Ligand binder design. Structure first.
Ligand SMILES: CCCCCCCCCCCCCCCCCC(=O)OC[C@H](CO[C@@H]1O[C@H](CO[C@H]2O[C@H](CO)[C@H](O)[C@H](O)[C@H]2O)[C@H](O)[C@H](O)[C@H]1O)OC(=O)CCCCCCCCCCCCCCCCC
Ligand SMILES: CCCCCCCCCCCCCCCCCC(=O)OC[C@H](CO[C@@H]1O[C@H](CO[C@H]2O[C@H](CO)[C@H](O)[C@H](O)[C@H]2O)[C@H](O)[C@H](O)[C@H]1O)OC(=O)CCCCCCCCCCCCCCCCC
Ligand code: CLA
Ligand code: CLA
Ligand code: CLA
Ligand code: CLA
Ligand SMILES: CCCCCCCCCCCCCCCCCC(=O)OC[C@H](CO[C@@H]1O[C@H](CO)[C@H](O)[C@H](O)[C@H]1O)OC(=O)CCCCCCCCCCCCCCCCC
Ligand SMILES: CCCCCCCCCCCCCCCC(=O)OC[C@H](COP(=O)(O)OC[C@@H](O)CO)OC(=O)CCCCCCCCCCCCCCC
Ligand SMILES: CC1=C(/C=C/C(C)=C/C=C/C(C)=C/C=C/C=C(C)/C=C/C=C(C)/C=C/C2=C(C)CCCC2(C)C)C(C)(C)CCC1
Ligand SMILES: CC1=C(/C=C/C(C)=C/C=C/C(C)=C/C=C/C=C(C)/C=C/C=C(C)/C=C/C2=C(C)CCCC2(C)C)C(C)(C)CCC1
Ligand SMILES: CC1=C(/C=C/C(C)=C/C=C\C(C)=C\C=C\C=C(C)\C=C\C=C(C)\C=C\C2=C(C)CCCC2(C)C)C(C)(C)CCC1
Ligand code: OEX
Ligand SMILES: [Cl-]
Ligand SMILES: [Fe+2]
Lengths: 37, 61, 341, 54, 76, 333, 450, 34
């Protein structure tokens, strides 16, 4: 368990590890936005 | 205290994350707005230091 | 003119999908077979025929759902919905295993209709019908196994079930009971399939790596007009490369493609013969000379005898639950077993 | 032997001698053609592949 | 004609689909949740695999008397 | 010129019957010695104690085998992963008793196939081609290396490698099924899809190209004689073949570009074989396939079986009977 | 727009990152952004693993791969391998997470706003992919940084707290390494060792002194090589053998990183000194040896004399001899007789296992450890079942060793494929025929017939 | 007994996912250098 002063932020911590993939998906989204120039 | 300071830290980080790339990408925005981003960076550093000091004081013996 | 000419003109018109005269046989049967599989894997159970759960409604996933074969008590009945077993009563028809017969019977005619469609389109456009002999291969495989194998055995119960894990069970079952890997026909089938895969890869890399420089950008894909007269790759360079690397190479572009057509179809047609042989229990199981020597000499051992022992273990430990209608009861003291485990 | 940890599997002087003999024979043959190289600042080039003769 | 590339855009298409599709989805949900599928297809319920009397698997043993055998095995 | 320059010019010449190259220097001796040892051992080798329990197994023709059941037995279990060359045995008889030839053949063979890939690249470079055929050849090499070397490394003994025989392959397959539950690993399904799709596309492409031949022969000669070495003609007739493919299935699915077509043909089976080789390599470290045993229960708590349970029964039957005299303790770790 | 379209550079959208080869301003931003992503993942994973910690189970029963490294470095671990506090892990995660923001901002700036090329306003930070002097300078600089990192690890091991030692006299504990080995014979016999069984190449390091001495020597070598490659330029024998372009350098790096991945995976599988078994779990051989030891102990307690008991084949049920003579455990585990673990060494004499010590010198803690390692062998399935393939669903555990080995082995193979592809393309493009065969001057047509 | 964990996780994941396309839309509207 996290130190008592930060236990409230547990749901955010449970989501951080996966953020680095959303970047890879965002690259494709950006490419599709400009219509695959 | 710790939790309110960390909440302010999170809010400031969210605002900076949303705003910075828009300013950087658009031509001329970073040049004109190159006076408040320094203030926000100083606030960010100050929040980090304050959180560190408060956590150290609370945890130390 | 008459009705026949008008209908014939309508059926061969240019639409989104070609219909043709064979469409009447093709579309309904294939649609019904697909719908039957989709509803069977979703709602129907195998509790009363196999003692298993095989639907999503019971708790199975994509890899464990199936449409199982009918019960063994119904040997080779056609299992019609109005037949003397169900007598209407859709529920009893589903419970005794009529969906399997439904799927297989309408699907065979679907395959026949697809072959007829290939013939019809080839005649319409005016080219030789070679894609209809290549499809006859898989037709032979399907007919052979899914119909001839059960028809030579006791009942429909010993047929493959339309599912993912049921096919694995079929593979292990035939290996355990027939020694199917030792048959000299599955060997030639394996050779054909692997040779087909090899041929597909070597050609596409050979073709892709001898392209003529017909462009200016690194993306060589956009350097080919939809169809020109010249070839896009160098035949001489490929011939030189493969004759200096491997020692032998192609030089005729028609023989190459005929070989590509010929290999896998020959493999499939060869395996069908072995399956038809297994249908009558005419298997290739024992080497009599090695059996005699091993019986006389208790020190002669090869990998053959080890495989034989493995088959014995499979049979003994699988038959009890694989055939629930036989009421097999094997006490722990008669089951074959090695040391420790 | 088998479980010991000698360098390159060498357990005798003759093995080392013959390894030296091999590397050195091929090296002498190579130096017979590439032995007159110089490090002066005029034998260099500006490109991806060295086409400057020898 | 009128290909999918601009069929996907027609507003009337979208509104009629929004009217129609949820009715089918809810109909399927109610089909499962009411328990009517168990009766249509004869699939046993999670508490119906074994009854108080029969504690073994109900396999069918006869060809021409499957109706009576199944009627016995289900409830009777 | 010098002697070294003449030697180098002869090695890299593109005028010999078979290209040599610098990779050929490693290629030819290793492959030749592996071939010689394999032939001699397959014909006239004595029985080998594979399991380390002093029960030798015969594998050669002269000891009462045929072509189907003959093999070259893997090395002994007592050796493990130790290096066992000829000069480490007290005599040649002891070397043959413990399965010496297997290591020699396997090692020189793997070096040979790696040099084969290198030589393919080298000739592609010398001929002015594009250098991506050895990449395609890397997949069978990857699979062979995976089995022969990687599986023993993970399991800790050369005796668990695939025997160099026909029935030994079946034995290896059956034991692997019993112990690791392949056929439930998605990478094996990828490999099966790869081979089936490769055969499908080979047949389809051959049929389409053969059907679209123009008329140059009439009746009394094989149609193959129409093509001449060096002729200029794209490998189809666009109208007939494209219309046939666009009418057989929905019109949206038709490859009008030869480049993209012959790229897809190359890509599919190669990726399949890469994935199945990596599946074997990962299963070498005890990361098995899906487990679905006793996963369906009724309300009370009793277990209702599925097909996976029948597969499990077959696996148990295979497992309890393999290497009957080799185990002493309840777990096969 | 120019420089971001196919019509001006080729390189269609699915290979668009190849447009940065000759644009040295945006490449810096891209590489910095990937570095920031790496730091972010490290911090986030540390925090996530800390949030789910349970103080009862061992670390290998909770699916952690990140806490074990910090524990091995000597943070929050006590005697025997028990976790006492998790504050240092929280601090490490927080520091990484904070530094990630600075790295990401720098990447974004240098990539989206900074100058496209640095060869016009910052001559120091400029290159041409063909100036050998500049490439050697960059290599030497970053190499000196690597050497400094290795020396930092040595300093941490020697003065700043110490490291966890699993061979410690009295159970695993944190201790200062005060006498590192510096004799080059030992280190370079580790380097020049055969990789087969019994030797193990560099995986076989089995004490902390050798580890510290090796990292010392690596630091020294890296510093010296960095200075050398900074102050010199490539010699003649190197100029005529290499290809001087960016893709060639990429392929060179790819091959080495693939080799490193293979080596790391085999470290994770076989070693138990840098990967102590109290944190990662028993190795492959260790479970089988533990099973044999446990059953020997039970049968001896029942009353048997376990030295002359004959097995089914007559070879020895509990004890036998290795092909070189040492006394080893019997059964199918005769292949793993090279094992060395801190809980077995008390029973080993000058010629293998000791009969008298086995007879009347076995302590209960060894028995408990053997039972635990026997029942926690590294076997499992994809959906985390654990056990042999023919087992039922009761436990939920897969060892971290298997995960690490499989993952980095997969990555190593695919990066070897990278060496092949990128290197072949680099050389073909350098020669000048990567676009296709020149139809006007086909080289094959001017060769002697075969 | 409310199980706030699932609601919090869903809200956090939704916000994180929506963050990116929001900045893309903002850059597109302001006629930025996409
Ligand atoms: C380099 C040459 C490459 C060819 C290598 C082939 C053999 C590799 C091998 O048997 O590797 C095994 C060795 C590990 O050696 C093991 O090392 C162990 C070290 O443990 C010892 O030390 C430990 C320290 O605590 C423990 O104490 C342990 O109990 C104790 O036994 C033992 O010595 C084992 O007997 C010994 O087998 O790893 C290695 O040498 C290190 C890794 C070498 C690089 C990886 C090789 C490349 C991958 C294989 C090729 C893949 C090809 C397909 C690619 C596609
Ligand atoms: C696209 C294909 C990949 C997506 C897979 C679907 C995603 C969701 C399903 C899934 O993933 O599954 C859901 C799981 C979360 O499920 C939980 O997963 C847990 C995992 O157990 C872990 O925890 C247990 C005790 O906590 C034990 O310690 C056990 O050993 C340890 O593995 C248990 O199974 C829980 O019961 C289960 O609820 O997602 C995970 O774990 C999250 C991790 C997934 C990303 C991690 C990448 C994979 C790791 C690299 C491996 C490389 C692959 C090997 C080389 C090939
Ligand atoms: C091309 C259309 C086509 C074809 C060839 C088949 C073929 C088949 N169906 Mg099928 N079916 C179809 C369309 C088709 N179906 C459609 C559209 C439906 C939905 C209404 C069904 C619903 C259906 C059911 C519910 C069942 C079948 C069954 C069968 C099988 C046995 C049918 C039988 O006994 O024939 C009977 C033969 C004839 C009727 C001959 C036709 C009569 C001649 C032409 C005129 C005679 C006039 C006479 C003097 C009065 C057979 C494989 C059965 C099955 O698979 O059992 C396992 C079964 O139970 N079908
Ligand atoms: C690690 C992954 C990575 C990285 C670092 C890059 C980086 C880059 N790519 Mg690239 N790319 C990638 C993956 C990546 N790519 C993938 C996977 C693909 C395949 C789809 C491509 C396809 C591709 C193409 C086709 C092209 C590039 C180009 C470029 C360069 C200019 C991009 C540009 O103008 O942005 C423009 C984009 C925007 C203005 C919108 C994004 C704004 C920011 C970056 C969003 C993220 C902000 C972040 C969440 C907030 C952080 C706040 C911070 C303070 C903490 C740049 C160096 C271009 C190039 O070569 O330029 C010369 C180009 O033409 N890439
Ligand atoms: C490997 C990392 C790396 C490298 C090589 C560079 C290199 C460079 N940066 Mg940069 N930068 C980095 C990381 C890096 N940056 C990070 C992480 C940040 C975020 C804090 C920045 C933020 C940053 C800013 C804000 C600016 C630069 C600038 C510069 C250029 C001039 C630097 C100078 O004069 O210092 C010389 C130092 C010693 C000789 C140079 C090309 C400047 C530039 O190019 O402006 C046009 C500039 O204004 N950088
Ligand atoms: C990342 C590690 C790395 C890399 C990529 C290089 C790369 C290189 N080194 Mg180098 N070197 C390194 C570390 C490294 N060095 C270290 C740590 C030392 C100290 C032992 C040296 C000592 C060294 C010497 C003494 C020489 C090279 C030379 C070379 C060049 C040819 C090497 C070859 O083909 O083999 C090449 C540019 C040779 C060269 O071309 O000299 C400039 C040469 O003579 N290196
Ligand atoms: C990259 C490659 C760069 C080299 C280019 C050349 C590639 C040639 C292909 C290699 C084939 C040659 C291999 C045959 C050698 C052999 O098997 O040795 C096999 C010998 C085993 O030696 C055996 O040892 C036993 C132990 O007592 C006994 O002594 C046996 O008699 C003895 O044969 O192993 C070695 O020589 C390994 C030493 C070198 C390994 C470390 C390499 C150091 C640099 C590491 C970088 C590469 C990783
Ligand atoms: C009850 C007895 C019913 C018999 C009526 C058949 C009439 C056919 C006349 C049609 C006729 O006179 O025209 C000949 C007909 C062509 O029809 P058209 O309408 O093109 O021809 C109009 C004129 O051209 C001449 O008919 O040729 C056919 O294809 C034959 C039909 C196939 C055979 C159909 C009969 C076989 C199926 C019988 C159904 C089974 C009964 C059991
Ligand atoms: C039998 C019968 C019949 C018939 C019926 C029918 C005809 C039906 C149909 C049905 C149908 C027709 C159905 C369908 C369904 C479907 C589904 C169920 C689907 C699903 C899907 C999915 C789920 C997918 C998945 C995926 C993939 C594959 C890939 C990608 C991803 C995804 C995920 C998307 C009748 C009446 C005659 C009567 C008698 C009996
Ligand atoms: C830290 C540590 C350690 C270690 C140490 C050391 C000292 C290491 C080293 C390492 C090393 C020292 C390595 C090296 C390597 C090398 C290499 C890897 C090489 C390679 C080569 C190449 C790659 C070449 C190639 C080529 C050829 C073949 C010829 C011509 C062409 C070319 C150039 C391409 C120890 C274990 C003690 C302990 C733990 C810690
Ligand atoms: C750390 C932190 C944070 C966070 C931040 C971040 C860093 C985020 C951003 C980033 C993100 C996280 C973003 C992402 C987004 C993404 C997305 C959401 C995407 C989507 C995707 C998709 C949907 C795709 C699809 C497609 C298309 C469109 C086309 C082509 C095809 C495909 C399928 C690929 C906060 C604020 C809480 C504060 C605290 C700390
Ligand atoms: O060596 Mn060939 O097979 Ca692999 O598991 Mn344990 O070890 Mn033996 O038994 Mn089962
Ligand atoms: Cl054992
Ligand atoms: Fe062709």
């Amino acid at each position: 368990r996290l130190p008592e002063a930060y236990v409230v932020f547990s749901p955010l911590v449970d989501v951080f590890p996966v953020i680095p993939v959303f970047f890879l998906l965002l690259a494709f989204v950006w490419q599709a936005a400009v219509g695959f120039r | 205290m710790i939790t309110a300071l960390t909440a302010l830290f999170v809010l400031v980080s969210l605002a900076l994350v949303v705003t910075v790339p828009v300013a950087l990408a658009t031509p001329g925005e970073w040049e004109t707005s190159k006076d408040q981003f320094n203030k926000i960076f100083q606030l960010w550093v100050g929040l980090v230091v304050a959180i560190a000091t408060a956590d150290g004081i609370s945890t130390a013996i | 003119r008459g009705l026949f000419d008008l209908v014939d003109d309508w059926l061969k018109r240019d639409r989104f999908v070609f219909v043709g005269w064979s469409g009447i046989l093709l579309f309904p049967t294939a649609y019904l077979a697909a719908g039957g599989w989709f509803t069977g894997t979703t709602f129907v159970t195998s509790w009363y025929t196999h003692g298993l759960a095989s639907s999503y409604l019971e708790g199975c996933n994509f890899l464990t759902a199936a449409v199982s074969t009918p019960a063994n008590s119904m040997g080779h009945s056609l299992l019609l919905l109005w037949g003397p077993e169900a007598q209407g009563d859709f529920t009893r028809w589903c419970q005794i295993g009529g969906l399997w017969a439904f799927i297989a019977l309408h699907g065979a005619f679907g395959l026949i209709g697809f072959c007829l469609r290939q013939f019809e389109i080839a005649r319409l456009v005016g080219i030789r019908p070679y894609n209809a002999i290549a499809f006859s291969g898989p037709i032979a495989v399907f007919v052979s196994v899914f119909l001839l194998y059960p028809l030579g055995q006791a009942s429909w119960f010993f047929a493959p079930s339309f599912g993912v894990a049921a096919i694995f069970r079929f593979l292990l079952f035939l290996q355990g009971f027939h020694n199917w890997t030792l048959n000299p026909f599955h060997m030639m089938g394996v050779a054909g399939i692997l040779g087909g895969a090899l041929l597909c890869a070597i050609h596409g890399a050979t073709v892709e790596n001898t392209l003529f420089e017909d462009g200016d950008a690194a993306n060589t894909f956009r350097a080919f007009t939809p169809t020109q007269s010249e070839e896009t790759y160098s035949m001489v360079t490929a011939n030189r490369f493969w004759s200096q690397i491997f020692g032998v190479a192609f030089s005729n572009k028609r023989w190459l493609h005929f070989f590509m057509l010929f290999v896998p179809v020959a493999g499939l047609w060869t395996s069908s013969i072995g399956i038809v042989g297994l249908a009558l229990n005419l298997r290739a199981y024992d080497f009599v000379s090695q059996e005699l020597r091993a019986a006389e000499d208790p020190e002669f051992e090869t990998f053959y005898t080890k495989n034989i022992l493995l088959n014995e273990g499979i049979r003994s430990w699988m038959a009890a639950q694989d055939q629930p209608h036989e009421n097999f009861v094997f006490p722990e003291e008669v089951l074959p077993r090695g040391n420790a485990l | 032997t088998e479980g010991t940890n000698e360098w390159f599997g060498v357990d005798d002087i003759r093995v080392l001698a013959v390894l030296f003999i091999g590397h050195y024979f091929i090296l002498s043959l190579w130096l017979g053609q590439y032995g007159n190289a110089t490090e002066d600042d005029d034998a260099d080039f500006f490109g991806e592949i060295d086409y400057t003769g020898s | 004609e009128r290909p999918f590339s601009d069929i996907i855009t027609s507003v009337r298409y979208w509104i009629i689909h929004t009217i129609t599709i949820p009715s089918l989805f809810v109909s399927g949900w109610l089909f499962i949740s009411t328990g009517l599928a168990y009766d249509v297809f004869g699939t046993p319920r999670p508490n119906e695999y074994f009854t108080q009397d029969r504690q073994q698997v109900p396999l069918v043993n006869d060809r021409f008397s499957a109706k009576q055998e199944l009627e016995d095995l289900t409830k009777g | 010129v010098s002697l070294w320059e003449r030697f180098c010019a002869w090695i890299t010449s593109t005028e010999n019957r078979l290209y040599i190259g610098w990779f050929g220097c490693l290629m030819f001796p290793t492959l030749l010695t592996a071939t010689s040892c394999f032939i001699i051992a397959f014909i006239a080798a004595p029985p080998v104690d594979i399991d380390g329990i002093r029960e030798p197994v015969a594998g050669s023709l002269l000891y009462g085998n045929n072509i189907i059941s003959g093999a070259v037995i893997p090395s002994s279990n007592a050796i493990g992963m130790h290096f066992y060359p000829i000069w480490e045995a007290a005599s040649v008889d002891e070397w043959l008793y413990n399965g010496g030839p297997y290591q020699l053949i396997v090692l020189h063979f793997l070096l040979g196939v790696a040099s084969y890939m290198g030589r393919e690249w080298e000739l592609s470079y010398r001929l002015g081609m594009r250098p991506w055929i050895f990449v395609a050849f890397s997949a069978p090499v990857a699979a062979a290396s995976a089995v022969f070397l990687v599986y023993p490394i993970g399991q800790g003994s050369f005796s668990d490698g695939m025997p160099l025989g026909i029935s030994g392959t079946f034995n290896f397959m059956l034991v692997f099924q019993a112990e690791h539950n392949i056929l439930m690993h998605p990478f094996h399904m990828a490999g099966v899809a790869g081979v089936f799709g490769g055969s499908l596309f080979s047949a389809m492409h051959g049929s389409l190209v053969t059907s679209s031949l123009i008329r140059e022969t009439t009746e009394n000669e094989s149609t193959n004689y129409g093509y001449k070495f060096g002729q200029e003609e794209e490998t189809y007739n666009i109208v007939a073949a494209h219309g046939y493919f666009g009418r057989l299935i929905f019109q949206y699915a038709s490859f009008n570009n030869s480049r993209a077509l012959h790229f897809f043909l190359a890509l599919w089976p190669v990726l399949g074989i890469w994935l199945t080789a990596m599946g074997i390599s990962t299963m070498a470290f005890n990361l098995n396939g899906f487990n679905f045993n006793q996963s369906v229960v009724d309300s009370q708590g009793r277990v209702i079986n599925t097909w996976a349970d029948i597969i499990n029964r077959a696996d148990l039957g295979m497992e309890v009977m393999h290497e009957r005299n080799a185990h002493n303790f309840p777990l096969d770790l | 727009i120019a420089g971001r379209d196919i019509e001006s550079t080729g390189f269609a959208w699915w290979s668009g990152n190849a447009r940065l080869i000759n644009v040295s301003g945006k490449l810096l931003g891209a590489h910095v952004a990937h570095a920031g992503l790496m730091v972010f993942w490290a911090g986030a994973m540390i925090l996530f693993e800390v949030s789910h910690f349970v103080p009862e189970k061992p670390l290998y029963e909770q699916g952690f791969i990140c806490m074990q490294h910090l524990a091995t470095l000597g943070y929050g671990i006590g005697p025997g391998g028990e976790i006492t506090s998790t504050v240092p892990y929280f601090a490490v995660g927080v520091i990484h997470l904070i530094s990630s923001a600075v790295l990401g901002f720098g990447g974004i700036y240098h990539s989206l706003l900074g100058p496209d090329t640095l060869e016009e306003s910052f001559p120091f930070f400029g290159y041409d992919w063909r100036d050998k002097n500049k490439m050697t300078t960059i290599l030497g600089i970053h190499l000196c940084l690597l050497g400094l990192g290795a020396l930092l690890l040595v300093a941490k091991a020697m003065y700043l707290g110490g490291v966890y030692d699993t061979w410690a006299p009295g159970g695993g504990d944190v201790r200062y390494i005060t006498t590192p080995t510096l004799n080059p014979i030992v280190i370079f016999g580790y380097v020049f060792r055969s990789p087969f069984g019994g030797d193990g190449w560099v995986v076989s390091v089995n004490n902390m002194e050798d580890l510290v001495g090796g990292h010392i020597w690596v630091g020294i070598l890296c510093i010296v090589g960095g200075v050398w490659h900074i102050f010199t330029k490539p010699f003649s024998w190197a100029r005529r053998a290499f290809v001087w372009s960016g893709e060639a350098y990429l392929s060179y790096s790819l091959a080495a990183i693939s080799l490193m991945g293979f080596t790391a995976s085999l470290y994770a599988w076989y070693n138990n000194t840098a990967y102590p078994s109290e944190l990662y779990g028993p190795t492959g051989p260790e479970a089988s040896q533990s099973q044999a030891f446990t059953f020997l102990v039970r049968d001896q307690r029942l009353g048997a004399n376990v030295s002359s008991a004959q097995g089914p084949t007559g070879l020895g049920k509990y004890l036998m001899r290795s092909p070189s003579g040492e006394i080893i455990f019997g059964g199918e585990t005769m292949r793993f007789w090279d094992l060395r673990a801190p809980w077995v060494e008390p029973l080993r004499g000058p010629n293998g296992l000791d009969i008298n010590k086995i007879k009347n010198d076995i302590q209960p803690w060894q028995e408990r450890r053997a039972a635990e390692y026997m029942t926690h062998a590294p076997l499992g399935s994809l959906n985390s079942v654990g056990g042999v393939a023919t087992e039922i669903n009761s436990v939920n555990y897969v060892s971290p060793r298997s995960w690490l080995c499989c993952s980095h082995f997969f990555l190593g193979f695919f990066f070897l494929i990278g060496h092949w592809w990128h290197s072949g393309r680099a050389r073909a493009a350098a020669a000048g025929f990567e676009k296709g065969i020149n139809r006007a001057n086909e080289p094959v047509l001017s060769m002697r017939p075969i | 007994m409310v199980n706030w964990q699932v609601i919090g996780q869903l809200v956090s994941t939704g916000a994180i996912m929506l963050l990116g396309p929001a900045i893309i839309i903002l850059l597109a509207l302001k006629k930025g250098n996409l």
